[PDB]
Design a protein around this ligand. Structure first.
Ligand SMILES: Nc1ncnc2c1ncn2[C@@H]1O[C@H](COP(=O)(O)O)[C@@H](O)[C@H]1O
Lengths: 64, 347, 98, 140, 49, 120, 53, 52, 69, 55, 19, 459, 320, 101, 50
């Protein structure tokens, strides 16, 4: 019971916002999100630009 | 507390309020206001304790200052108009002075500083009277002067009153101070809508009057004044705990209860006049109101607070108080939603 | 309008700025209330007597009497404080805050 | 202090830094004066000197907030060559939040003030562009 | 008997019971008569005869 | 917002022209809902005084139902009269001023342009 | 709201004091009796908005 | 269960560490809490990081 | 199953048609209500939004003591 | 790091902390009527001059 | 086992003059 | 829909008039009869919706949700009739009353013709769930979970109210059929940006979206079994149905608007699934599995492709049934061992063979084993998202690992290994529990044969 | 509700029945002072109604059948256990004293209601103005703590201040040795277990705190052990008294009407008795309170109001 | 000191000791057997079996099968008159007015 | 009856079902008027659907 309460409910009352926790939250909390958003925006822009100029092979693609 | 004298005093209060309602002259409006406050002074000195004297002194000082401002507005209106019909004023200073005079009378923030104190120091019947019947007459006065009301001043007073009432009720643990700050927030809520459609103002006034009457009737019936005795009441009558739970659920505007009727329809008259940020802000402050309401129901019925030993004698005696109009006002404050368009009778 | 009108407004604002930021007991507040009384009475009487509104001579006298009774009520309130704390000071009015 | 808002909005965004800076500084000074006056009226000062010290602290803090926010919004609007962008007001609001956090001797409060003041300045730009009216005149 | 003291609500107040019954009957027949008169005036006004 | 309509006959709950409308039936669903509210009020009154809820105070429950159904019928009549006034005034001012209400030529779909945004 | 009891039961209480151009004892004229008479006859029964416009 | 048999904040002085070691039923020397980096470990001791 | 329980497709079709017509009429009436409220509040010459003025019946038409009025 | 601390910190806990802090600042009056009337004077002066509510 | 109910600590948290 | 509301309003006195020993049997019999009569809503068409009146209609989308709701309520009464055997008769009848009122509220909400009626009924669903959570919950801190749930819902739904009233005042109506025929495109403006945010954030709160999902790992744990089931299997799908209705009105802004939100799920459903790799509480593991499935639903609805819609509704129904079964399994194990710790009770297969079989079937249906409904829905979502973009297959494919990597893990630690020594109160399987789990499982395996009725409105 | 303000409007004046013989007389003494019969003699001398000492089951006796309810339903405290272990862990001492003060307050409310309504004087034993002399005798013997003492002081301060003291009080002076000898000759198997220091403390609080204020706020008479037997001397002494002290002089019809309204609401009398002050000798948690409340609701005659119980044989329940 | 008065923790109720053939429903055996009968009749025998019968025999769901039959006509038309299999325009191009530019 | 509660809901079902048919009688403004199903009424048939 001590281990479960230390793992579950006693993590926030013993938290102090400092530079280490802020850096680890900025590196892991929003970094993957902005990286994924940028790579997906680039890929979708490339796909839309290829489609609107009529070069992508979409002849038999009728399920979407 | 001679019953003849109490009956005569209550009839004087009713006569003063109805004189404010039915008159066509500014002097008679002030006459009704003065007779109403003069006859409501003995109501807050019923129990004869020094806290009541303190509360009545503060109330008299604030109401007399508001009345002197009211004559300042009337005399300025006479100067600039030469006539006395209760209608739109003929001077911006008259409208401004009248607006904060009625704000002082109604406990609208930042002129609200007497409302959480006075209601703390008076008996619960006098608190019910002050928070229910006193608000009726200056609503009529503000309704009859709406063409000349400055939009900026009444909007600033409304938003300040709503925010201040919510944030002040967020901290108090006494029932009367919570009731006072809730009344302040509801006053701001139903004065924000006045310039666009006063039928919504009248509907919110009637709903707030009924719901506050139910709350005060339950508080006098349970003989509870603080949070702890209201928690302790679950040994005596659980049906009263269920009733206070459902009407406090209704008090925060949670559907399908009656308290969701006015404010939502108030928003129905905010987007007609192209205003979007304002109902959102007052809805967030209503969420603050619902937070301390939820705290009250958590203390009252949704938990089971530890009691004392003497409850057993209180289990051998039924409630002998004159629980008057409690079931009708409880039903009318919870299940009135499918009869929403009844507000058409208030046009 | 006339200059005496503006003098009465300035007098009423003087009574207003004296009624709010007091330091003494409640008698000063009631005296400033009577200043508001007197300023409103003189202004109403001057207005009624200048524009020849004959009927509205009912306005000034009534404008006293009602609030005069209200003023009497205030005196009784002070007596209550004089029967409770000995002195009617406003700094003793700090029992309802808690 | 209504015409001061008009004079703040009469200067186009990202054109002249000086007058926008003094207009925002005067707005901040007025807001700090109102807050300090209400604080002195409600909370009784210990003496005259401590009261005017609190008044000067609040007034200078709010004036610095206004000046920093206006200056940062103007330099960002100049460096982006786009007056019609809420990004400049977001950057200015974050600069104001950072200055408030530095004045209050805090950093988490400074980051929260960055976020909330940037969002508020962005919404101010939103209302300026799309004509949002929170104080709407009665139309119907 | 079970209770040593006689309760105030031990016996039914026959005057109040008769008053409630008479008030209910009067209000019911008044509502019915009012509805009949209003519907008769409606059909006479709009000619649904 | 009808301050200039009822001013000719003030303090009239149900005027004479309200008799020109079809009165609501005694089997109106709103009226039965108000009767249910009266029955619920009687049940609450029996419950808060520590009485048998479904047996005690039958005459009390019948009086509650009767009073609620009476006031509900009259309030429904006033609501119907008010909304008849509302849409009658709407139609009257629409008929009186057809310069501010032009007849829009409803074009067909054969020539109007709707912008298409493909989804992919 | 504005309940009109006086217009309902047809009894005057304060209509005589309400305007300066009303009837007064011995028909003593005010300074601006004609101006108020013309203003009221201009602004009767047409609404406050059209009266002020 | 009871409140003082449950984990709390990070101990600093020797007697709080001794009370924590009594609660966690180790020696006062074998009780090595995690460093106060503000992560939320509390007064939970650091075992030598070995598999079962 | 189709005979005992389920309704005919034509019945559902025409019921949907009537429902759609009723709701379209209600929407058009609501839009007309908003437009007429805006226009006649802005102009102020309609049955609603008529803020009261002073009644003209209270003026005394009798001659006065001084004729210069 | 994220689902128990930071996500708990951004939306709900900062809001709750600001709410309780400014609620404690609002309800910390000394009950003196003189301070209330002085605040009334400051409000009236601000409305008459600094906002110009009577134009 | 059984459902938990508030003890003396919760009441004394809610029992003060200021919460 | 007045043929189903009146039976529930007659079920209300049916549980207020029975004896103290006959409430459960009568309520179960009549609710199962109503569930039998619930199948008449399947008279649908491939091109038209079944409309009854001006206020109630039901297409091929709301019909499976209705059937699931009034099939789940008798299961709720079975699951919650043992741990309340010590309660007062009045409180037991109040519990049944709240459950019946909640079912009535849900069946009135799912058939709302106009959107404002749907909104008010959607907020009206708050009251009995909050009452159940804050009254009949077991743990100490249930008040915090109830407050978090109520405030997340209300703070989401009030801008939804403002946007709905603005839309009604702008165009003229809020009927779904009229809005289907009176739809207007929304240009790329900041006013339309905040309109989209106000119309979406309520449903992203109740789905829940990753980042705003924090009300789930609390309110799913400390609540009782009936409250856990109504939180896991209905209300998230209520938010999904609302988002499906609303997203018709917000084209074509969403095509450039839903880029963060989709990806706020497209990473989040990874790491939340990783949280299930390191969870000591079984109910929290089930709640985070629900979070991952609802994130998949968010992606499918927000990309607004047809195959995504079919996968969304199929995964909705399958995940609701599977999560209800898993919550019942957690409740039964917690009743037997009096602790929610997963590492405590081990080796339950050697003592409970039939319960181990039910655990295996539930875990297999959780990891999308074909040809179950969950595999069909998740496969359709993966096809649709691969049509949207290529690289996102990775963001789904790795999830295909991690889901198994917790679910069979949940199957291992609770069932496989040497049994605990000091635990000696493991009773044999109750017939009530076995009946409840068979009633949870057999409809899923039967609908695996004929899934064409739960594939959406556009099949 | 029978008596209300409408009756006072209609002419129900309470000083119409307030003759010179309507006197509130309470008698005090030690543990076994022998006053118990003496007041009975007064009940056959001035014609006054006499009320016995308020026991544990007094509130059980006044309502319902009057049968003694079991100690679980009412009281949860026994005098035998107090005589056994005064310093017990469960705190029988302060719980018994608080319950007995509540029962005495109920008895005094009933006595005041009877005196105000019927106009007949009432004789009591050990009224609520003479109960703290027990509790202080506990605290000087270490039988309770200081928190219990100040909680009892708060309860007395919020309860007594709405009532008037009796007209004449009579204290019987029996010394400690006589009290112990009378206890020994009485034959109760559990009454010798108290130390004589408790009786000495009762006498000390009586002659040090009770008498110095009942010599001022009311009329006081004092008698020795043998002079209590002579009833004619006592009734001649009380009948030849000159009432000048006490607030019974300045009582108009309005104040007595308000007192009659307040004493006819039994909830209002005992509303401030059980204030929410959590002292571990009197507070009981939710589970036991719920269990004993659901058990008391199942008792015959107590499930509903007194006129609405079918299981005890009340007819026309459906016409009320 | 001692805290507030409270009952000790009640033990869990082992139902099989007081009844060897109980089923986790109720103390008394008769109402327990009635509960078993009603759940297994109205849960498996009544709703599941008749529900499978009902869903197995919906009357040509969504007209979808009918559509196939309609297709069985339509190509039969378009393979007789020499028309192309399927037009690339859903509506008639002769009734479309393009916006002139 | 001794088991009257057991027939409280099914009767309350069918009556509600009856009300639906009554509601159908309020939505017959386009009966035999739709363009797909506009046909001449057959003899001994008063309506296309009741
Ligand atoms: N603290 C106390 N200890 C014992 N008995 C008490 C106490 N307080 C009141 N009593 C009552 O006083 C009675 C003694 O009075 P009596 O024997 O009638 O002269 C006892 O039998 C108890 O009912």
């Amino acid at each position: 019971i001590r281990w479960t309460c230390a793992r579950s409910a006693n993590v926030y009352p013993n938290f102090r916002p400092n530079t280490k926790t802020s850096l680890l939250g900025a590196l892991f909390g929003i970094g993957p999100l902005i990286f994924w958003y940028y790579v997906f925006k680039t890929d979708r822009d490339r796909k839309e630009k290829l489609i609107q100029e009529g070069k992508l092979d979409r002849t038999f693609n009728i399920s979407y | 507390m001679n019953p003849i004298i109490l009956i005569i005093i209550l009839m004087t209060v009713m006569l003063g309020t109805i004189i404010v309602m039915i008159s066509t002259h500014w002097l008679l409006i002030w006459i009704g206001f003065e007779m109403n406050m003069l006859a409501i002074i003995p109501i807050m000195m019923k129990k004869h304790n020094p806290r009541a004297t303190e509360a009545s002194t503060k109330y008299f000082l604030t109401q007399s200052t508001a009345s002197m401002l009211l004559m300042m507005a009337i005399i300025i209106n006479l100067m600039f108009s030469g006539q006395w019909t209760v209608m739109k004023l003929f001077n911006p200073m008259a409208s401004m002075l009248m607006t904060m005079a009625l704000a002082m009378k109604l406990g609208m923030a930042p002129f609200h500083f007497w409302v959480p104190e006075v209601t703390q120091g008076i008996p619960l019947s006098s608190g019910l009277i002050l928070l229910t019947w006193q608000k009726l007459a200056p609503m009529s006065v503000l309704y009859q002067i709406l063409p000349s009301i400055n939009l900026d001043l009444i909007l600033t007073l409304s938003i300040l009153s709503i925010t201040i009432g919510g944030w002040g009720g967020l901290n108090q643990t006494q029932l009367r101070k919570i009731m006072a700050y809730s009344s302040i927030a509801h006053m701001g809520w139903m004065t924000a809508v006045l310039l666009y459609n006063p039928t919504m103002t009248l509907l919110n006034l009637i709903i707030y009057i009924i719901m506050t009457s139910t709350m005060f009737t339950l508080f006098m019936a349970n003989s509870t004044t603080t949070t702890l005795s209201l928690s302790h009441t679950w040994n005596k009558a659980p049906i009263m705990t269920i009733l206070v739970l459902i009407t406090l659920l209704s008090m925060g505007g949670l559907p399908p209860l009656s308290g969701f009727m006015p404010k939502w329809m108030i928003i129905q008259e905010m987007t007609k006049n192209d205003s979007i940020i304002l109902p959102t802000l007052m809805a967030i402050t209503a969420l603050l109101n619902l937070y301390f309401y939820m705290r009250l129901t958590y203390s009252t019925a949704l938990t089971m607070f530890p009691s004392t030993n003497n409850m057993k004698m209180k289990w051998q005696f039924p409630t002998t108080k004159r629980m008057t109009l409690l079931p009708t006002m409880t039903v009318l404050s919870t299940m009135l939603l499918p009869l929403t368009p009844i507000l058409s009778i208030l046009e | 309008m006339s200059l005496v009108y503006m003098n009465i407004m300035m007098a009423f604002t003087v009574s207003l700025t004296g009624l709010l930021m007091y330091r003494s007991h409640l008698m000063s507040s009631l005296l400033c209330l009577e200043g508001m009384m007197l300023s409103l009475f003189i202004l109403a009487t001057l207005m009624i007597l200048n524009s020849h509104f004959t009927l509205a001579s009912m306005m000034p006298i009534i404008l006293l009497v009602f609030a005069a009774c209200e003023a009497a009520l205030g005196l009784s309130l002070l007596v209550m404080v004089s029967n409770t704390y000995g002195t009617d000071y406003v700094q003793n009015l700090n029992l309802l805050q808690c | 202090a209504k015409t001061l808002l008009h004079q703040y909005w009469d200067i186009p965004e990202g054109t002249e830094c000086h007058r926008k800076t003094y207009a925002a500084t005067s707005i901040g000074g007025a807001s700090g004066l109102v807050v300090s006056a209400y604080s002195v009226a409600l909370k009784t000062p210990t003496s005259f000197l401590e009261g005017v010290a609190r008044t000067g602290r609040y007034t200078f803090t709010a004036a610095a907030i206004g000046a920093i926010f206006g200056l940062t919004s103007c330099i960002s609007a100049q460096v982006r060559e786009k007056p019609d962008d809420p990004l400049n007001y977001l950057i200015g609001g974050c600069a104001g939040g950072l200055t408030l956090g530095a004045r209050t001797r805090s950093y988490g409060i400074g980051a929260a003030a960055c976020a909330y003041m940037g969002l508020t300045a962005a919404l101010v730009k939103m209302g300026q562009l799309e004509g949002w009216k929170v104080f709407a005149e009665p139309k119907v | 008997k079970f209770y040593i003291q006689e309760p105030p609500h031990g016996s039914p107040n026959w005057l109040k019971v008769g008053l409630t019954l008479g008030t209910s009957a009067f209000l019911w027949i008044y509502l019915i008569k009012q509805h009949n008169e209003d519907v008769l005036e409606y059909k006479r006004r709009n000619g649904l005869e | 917002m009808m301050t200039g309509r009822q001013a000719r006959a003030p303090l009239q709950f149900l005027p004479d022209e309200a008799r020109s409308l079809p009165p609501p039936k005694l089997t109106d669903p709103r009226l039965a809902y108000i009767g249910f509210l009266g029955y619920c009020s009687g049940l609450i009154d029996n419950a808060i005084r520590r009485r048998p809820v479904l047996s005690a105070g039958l005459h009390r429950q019948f009086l509650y139902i009767t009073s609620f159904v009476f006031v509900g019928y009259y309030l429904l009549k006033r609501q119907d009269y008010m909304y008849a006034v509302r849409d009658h005034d709407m139609f009257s001012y629409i008929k009186s001023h057809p310069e501010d209400f032009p007849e829009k030529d409803k074009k067909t779909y054969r020539e109007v342009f709707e912008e298409f945004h493909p989804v992919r | 709201p504005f309940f009109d009891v006086q217009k309902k039961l047809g009894v005057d209480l304060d209509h005589w004091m309400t305007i300066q151009s009303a009837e007064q004892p011995h028909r003593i004229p005010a300074r601006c009796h004609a101006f108020e008479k013309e203003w009221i006859e201009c602004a009767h029964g047409i609404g406050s908005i059209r009266a002020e416009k | 269960i009871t409140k003082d048999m449950l984990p709390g904040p990070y101990p600093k002085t020797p007697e709080e560490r001794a009370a924590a070691a009594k609660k966690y039923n180790m020696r006062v020397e074998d009780y090595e809490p995690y460093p106060d980096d503000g992560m939320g470990y509390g007064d939970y001791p650091k075992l030598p990081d070995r598999s079962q | 199953i189709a005979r005992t329980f389920f309704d005919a497709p034509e019945k559902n079709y025409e019921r949907t048609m009537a429902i759609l017509q009723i709701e379209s009429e209600k929407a058009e009436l609501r839009l007309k209500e908003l437009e007429v409220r805006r226009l006649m509040r802005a102009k102020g010459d309609g049955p609603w939004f008529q803020y009261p003025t002073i009644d003209k019946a209270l003026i005394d038409h009798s001659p006065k003591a001084t004729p210069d009025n | 790091l994220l689902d128990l601390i930071w996500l708990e910190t951004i939306l709900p806990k900062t809001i709750s902390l600001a709410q309780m802090k400014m609620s404690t600042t609002i309800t910390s009056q000394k009950g003196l009527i003189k301070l209330y009337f002085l605040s009334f004077l400051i409000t009236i002066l601000i409305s008459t001059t600094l906002l110009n509510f009577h134009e | 086992a059984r459902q938990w109910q508030p003890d003396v600590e919760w009441a004394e948290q809610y029992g003060g003059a200021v919460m | 829909m007045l043929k189903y509301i009146i039976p529930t309003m007659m079920l209300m006195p049916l549980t207020w008039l029975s004896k103290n020993s006959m409430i459960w049997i009568n309520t179960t019999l009549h609710s199962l009869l109503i569930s039998l009569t619930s199948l008449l809503l399947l008279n649908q068409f491939g091109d038209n919706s079944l409309n009854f009146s001006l206020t109630f209609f039901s297409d091929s989308l709301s019909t499976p949700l209705l059937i699931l709701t009034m099939w789940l309520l008798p299961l709720m009464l079975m699951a919650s009739q043992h741990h309340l055997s010590k309660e007062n008769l009045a409180r037991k009848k109040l519990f049944i009353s709240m459950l019946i009122l909640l079912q009535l509220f849900l069946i009135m909400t799912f058939t709302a013709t106009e959107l404002i009626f749907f909104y008010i009924m959607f907020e009206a669903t708050l009251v009995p769930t909050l009452i159940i959570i804050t009254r009949w919950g077991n743990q100490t801190e249930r008040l915090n979970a109830g407050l978090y749930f109520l405030f997340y819902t209300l703070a989401g739904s009030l801008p939804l109210l403002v946007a709905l009233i603005y839309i009604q005042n702008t165009m003229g109506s809020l009927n779904f059929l009229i809005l289907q025929y009176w739809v207007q495109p929304m240009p790329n403006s900041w006013s339309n940006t905040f309109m989209w945010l106000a119309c979406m954030m309520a449903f992203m709160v109740k789905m829940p979206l990753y980042g705003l999902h924090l009300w789930l790992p609390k309110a799913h744990v400390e609540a009782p079994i009936a409250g856990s089931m109504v939180l896991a299997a209905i209300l998230l799908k209520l938010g999904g149905y609302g988002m499906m209705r609303i997203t018709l009105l917000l084209n074509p802004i969403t095509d450039f608007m839903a880029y963060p939100f989709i990806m706020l799920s497209l990473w989040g459903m990874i790491m939340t699934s990783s949280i299930c790799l390191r969870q000591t509480d079984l109910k929290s593991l089930i709640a985070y599995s629900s979070v991952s499935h609802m994130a998949l639903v968010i992606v499918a609805i927000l990309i607004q492709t047809p195959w995504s819609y079919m996968g969304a509704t199929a995964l909705m129904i399958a995940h609701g049934l599977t999560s209800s079964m898993l919550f019942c399994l957690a409740n039964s194990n917690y009743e037997r061992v009096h602790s929610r710790t997963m590492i405590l009770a081990r080796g339950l297969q050697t003592l409970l063979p039939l319960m181990a079989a039910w655990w295996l079937l539930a875990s297999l249906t959780n990891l999308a084993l074909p040809p179950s409904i969950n595999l069909i829905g998740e496969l359709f979502v993966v096809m649709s998202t691969f049509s949207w973009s290529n690289i996102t297959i990775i963001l789904m494919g790795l999830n295909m690992v991690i889901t198994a990597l917790y679910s069979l893990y949940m199957l291992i630690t609770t069932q496989r290994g040497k049994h605990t020594h000091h635990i000696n109160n493991i009773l044999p399987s109750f017939t009530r529990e076995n009946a409840l789990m068979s009633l949870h499982m057999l409809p899923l395996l039967l609908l695996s044969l004929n899934p064409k009725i739960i594939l959406g409105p556009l099949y | 509700l029978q008596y209300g303000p409408l009756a006072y409007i209609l002419g129900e004046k309470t000083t119409k029945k307030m003759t010179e013989n309507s006197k509130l007389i309470t008698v005090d003494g030690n543990i076994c002072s022998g006053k118990s019969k003496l007041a009975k003699e007064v009940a056959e001398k001035l014609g006054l109604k006499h009320f016995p000492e308020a026991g544990i089951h007094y509130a059980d006796s006044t309502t319902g059948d009057g049968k003694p309810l079991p100690v679980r339903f009412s009281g949860n405290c026994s005098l035998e256990k107090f005589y056994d272990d005064p310093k017990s862990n469960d705190g029988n001492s302060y719980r018994l004293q608080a319950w007995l003060y509540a029962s005495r307050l109920l008895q005094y409310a009933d006595a005041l209601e009877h005196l105000l309504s019927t106009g007949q004087g009432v004789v009591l034993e050990r009224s609520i103005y003479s109960d703290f002399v027990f509790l202080e005798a506990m605290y000087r013997q270490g039988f309770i703590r200081k928190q219990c003492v100040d909680h009892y002081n708060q309860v007395k301060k919020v309860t007594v201040c709405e009532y008037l003291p009796p007209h004449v009080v009579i204290y019987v002076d029996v010394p400690v040795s006589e009290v112990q000898s009378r206890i020994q000759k009485k034959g109760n198997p559990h009454e010798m277990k108290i130390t004589s220091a408790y009786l000495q403390d009762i006498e000390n609080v009586y002659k040090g705190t009770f008498l110095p204020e009942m010599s001022e706020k009311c009329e006081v008479l004092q008698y020795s052990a043998w002079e209590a037997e002579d009833a004619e001397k006592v009734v001649e002494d009380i009948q030849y008294l000159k009432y000048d002290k006490g607030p019974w002089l300045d009582q108009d019809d309005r104040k007595l009407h308000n007192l009659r309204m307040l004493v006819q609401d039994k909830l209002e009398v005992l509303n401030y008795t059980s204030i929410p002050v959590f002292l571990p000798e009197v507070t009981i948690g939710a589970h036991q309170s719920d269990r004993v409340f659901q058990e008391f609701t199942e008792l015959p005659g107590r499930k509903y109001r007194a006129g609405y119980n079918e299981d005890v044989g009340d007819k026309w329940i459906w016409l009320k | 000191t001692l805290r507030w008065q409270e009952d000790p923790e009640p033990e869990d109720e082992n139902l099989y000791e007081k009844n060897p053939d109980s089923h986790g429903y109720d103390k008394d055996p008769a109402v327990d057997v009635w509960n078993m009968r009603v759940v297994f009749f109205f849960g498996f025998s009544i709703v599941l079996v008749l529900g499978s019968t009902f869903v197995a025999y919906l009357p040509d769901y969504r007209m979808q099968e009918w559509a196939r039959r309609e297709a069985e006509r339509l190509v039969k038309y378009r393979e007789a008159h020499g028309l192309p299999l399927m037009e690339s325009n859903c509506f008639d191009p002769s009734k479309i007015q393009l916006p002139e530019d | 009856r001794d088991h009257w509660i057991h027939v409280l809901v099914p009767v309350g079902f069918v009556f509600g079902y009856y009300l639906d048919r009554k509601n159908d009688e309020k939505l017959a403004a386009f009966r035999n008027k739709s363009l797909l199903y506009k046909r001449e009424l057959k003899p001994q048939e008063e309506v296309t659907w009741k």
